[model samples]
Target: LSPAIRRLLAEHNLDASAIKGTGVGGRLTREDVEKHL
Candidate 1:
């Protein structure tokens, strides 16, 4: 994950578990987090 991704998730009070991963191999992507917002 990018440093910005961690910061965004923490700052926005979001959890990665809450969003489903749609990236290759079912991995999480920046777009996944942003889309959650």
Candidate 2:
């Protein structure tokens, strides 16, 4: 993701740790991305 998307998440108080990662090695998933949205 770009910095803009990351900034938006931060603005909404959605930290990476707050999301349920489903990426490689238990990373964030696309659904997790939607959670902040």
Candidate 3:
């Protein structure tokens, strides 16, 4: 994930490691962060 996504995750104090992301290889896209909220 990009720092752009990191900022978003920080907005919610979320841990990127455990937030499940459905991707080609378990990658967390920006959209995934949006979904988290």
Candidate 4:
């Protein structure tokens, strides 16, 4: 996970596992979280 995404998750108190990743290998990206929000 990228630093920005990590921080974003932290700020939102979100569980990474609860999110659905759309990137390659289901890796989470900043845009994924943005779209989720």
- Say which candidate scores most in TM-score: 1
Clashing pairs in 1: none
lDDT (tens digit, per residue) of candidate 1 on 1-37: 7778768877989879989999999998987888778
Model 2, position 7: C-alpha lDDT score = 69
Cα lDDT tens digits, model 4, 1-37, are: 6657667877888876777888898777777778777
- Which 10-residue window of candidate 4 scores lowest in summed lDDT? 1-10
Report the lDDT tens digits of candidate 3 across residue range 1-37.
Answer: 6667667766779887877777779877777767767
Model 3 gets an lDDT of 0.74
Off by over 4 Å in 4: none
The C-alpha stretches of model 3 lying farther than 4 A from their native spots are 1-3
Model 4 residue 18 lDDT score:
73
Ordering by TM-score: 1, 4, 3, 2
State TM-scores per candidate.
0.70, 0.47, 0.54, 0.60
Which digits, one per residue and each the tens of the lDDT, describe model 2 over residues 1-37? 5557656666777667766787788876567778667
Once fitted onto the true fold, the runs of candidate 1 whose alpha carbons sit more than 4 angstroms away are none
Candidate 1 Cα deviation (angstroms), residue 13: 1.1
How much is the lDDT of residue 37 in candidate 1?
88
lDDT per model vs. reference = 0.83, 0.70, 0.74, 0.76
